[PDB]
Design a protein around this nucleic acid. Structure first.
Ligand SMILES: [K+]
Ligand SMILES: [K+]
Ligand SMILES: [K+]
Ligand SMILES: [Mg+2]
Ligand SMILES: [Mg+2]
Length: 136
RNA sequence: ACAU
DNA sequence: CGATGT
């Protein structure tokens, strides 16, 4: 089982969990940063991993790219497959922004199609995903 | 247990 | 050491 180098890798970064959430997508081969989301003041790790995949799908579709996406998040891969982010984060005024983005990402999934394979990055075999923030 |  | 998730 080998890395598919012609791919997009995504990952969340956070300050606290729940805490400040950001995410980015990179070229798996070169590490070039292709997109980065502006920090969101409160969210969870899994909400951010979910948003990163959905943004990757939107990014690749806009560019007519058939590359797969790698994520290290078992949870977020499932949530994208299900088109449903099963987060436990409370809804209040401080979490309104992240929940709006997650709701809108689900809505996009329910109104668009894609063939993009969403693949598990095998951290145990390959080390940290290329989009990692280097914070652990 | 597994993945973050 | 704590949290988010299956
Ligand atoms: K990891
Ligand atoms: K990190
Ligand atoms: K646990
Ligand atoms: Mg990750
Ligand atoms: Mg990471």
């Amino acid at each position: 089982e080998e890395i598919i180098w012609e791919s997009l890798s995504v990952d969340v970064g956070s300050q606290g969990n729940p805490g400040i959430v950001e995410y980015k997508g990179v070229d798996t081969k070169t590490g070039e940063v292709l997109f980065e989301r502006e920090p969101i003041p409160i969210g969870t790790n899994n909400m951010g991993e979910f948003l990163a995949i959905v943004h990757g799908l939107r990014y690749l579709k806009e560019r007519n790219s058939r590359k797969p996406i790698y994520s290290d998040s078992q949870t977020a891969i499932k949530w994208v497959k299900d088109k449903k982010a099963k987060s436990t984060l409370v809804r209040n005024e401080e979490t309104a922004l992240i929940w709006k983005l997650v709701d809108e990402a689900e809505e996009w999934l329910n109104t668009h199609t894609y063939e993009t394979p969403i693949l598990k990055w095998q951290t145990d075999k390959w080390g940290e995903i290329k989009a990692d923030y280097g914070r652990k």
